[model samples]
Target: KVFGRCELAAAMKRHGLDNYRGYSLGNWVCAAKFESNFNTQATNRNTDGSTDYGILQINSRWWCNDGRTPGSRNLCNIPCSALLSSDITASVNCAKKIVSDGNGMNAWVAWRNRCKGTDVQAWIRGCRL
Candidate 1:
């Protein structure tokens, strides 16, 4: 499912993403907008043969195991397919793990390149948190 801006904000907040790791909910919203446009089933294959799965685009290399990424650490200890579910629990949990691992939101290129230091609050302007 493709979530609207406020809907995604609410969902992420409900999952405890708001202000997690010093990153604001707006930062998450902006990063997710660029990551997969809030699409739960989004997937992207990298040239290095790894894949990024789900709304937050969790990578297969060090996070989720797709049974295809060579030498995947699978630090999240879950199948990459789990992130594609519309429920988003696995995706959110994996995302939290990624940030908690000291990478913060920088694990996602979209966040670093597009969201970092930007006026991320605009992404959730209308959302009634």
Candidate 2:
């Protein structure tokens, strides 16, 4: 996953988040990064052309999976108003929330576990603005 820390900062800032802004936002993003690399235009091809669209990597078959369409692509996580407002952040936040539940963001927790072999504080600080 190539979701750079700087890009994440910009995305967070767009949603009024300056420093990771809760485990939901930052936590999920890190998870997505680890899974897919945060490719906004990412797509997975199926035998029947079924595709997943957006950052959350939602499968579009559940709703709309259009490879030719600009909006519908990877990860059916289409952007809704308020949440996504038809924006990419919507999908990002949606997926991020899954990891950010009362459990305290699995991505962060995973990062913490991974940190066992490295400087965790520095790694965590690097993501924060």
Candidate 3:
């Protein structure tokens, strides 16, 4: 949603997402940078014919319905557009479900490939949290 780093960190904490499922704010912020650059409207078509949506870049194959993906599980029970918002409540809740389901942020390829084992302290630099 075009957020500056501290702004997003505060919002996530306000939504009780600071450390859900052992995923630190560092993990979320770093992955958001790599996956969508904090653009909530970001979308990408995967090689497997599925689409990723919003800031978390959740996949339509499991978490949301983008109308083009038939038979999607829609585990989030939310329309894909719901994730593309500055508010981020729906998307964050959905992402929590994903992490609780044992993905541990590894569900996002960006997180696994880019943020894992990296020092992401800079993502929240001077946030005053």
**Largest TM-score belongs to which candidate?**
1
lDDT of each: 0.91, 0.46, 0.85
Ranking by lDDT: 1, 3, 2
- In TM-score terms, candidate 2 sits at 0.45
Candidate 3 lDDT over 1-129, as tens digits, reads 587778888888888777787678888888888988988999899787688888888889889888888758889999888999877898898989998988688888888999999887778989978
Q: Candidate 1 at residue 76, lDDT?
A: 92
Which pairs clash in the backbone of model 3? 1-40
TM-score of each candidate? 0.96, 0.45, 0.94
Candidate 1, residues 1-129, lDDT tens digits: the string is 998999999999999998898899999989989999989898999899899899999999999999989979989999999999888899989899899987788878889999999999999998888
Q: Order of all candidates by TM-score, from best down to worst?
A: 1, 3, 2
Deviation in Å, model 3, residue 57 alpha carbon:
0.3
Model 1 score (lDDT):
0.91
Candidate 3, residue 123: Cα displacement in angstroms equals 1.1
Measured over all alpha carbons after superposition, the RMSD of each candidate to the real structure, in angstroms, is: 0.9, 7.2, 1.1
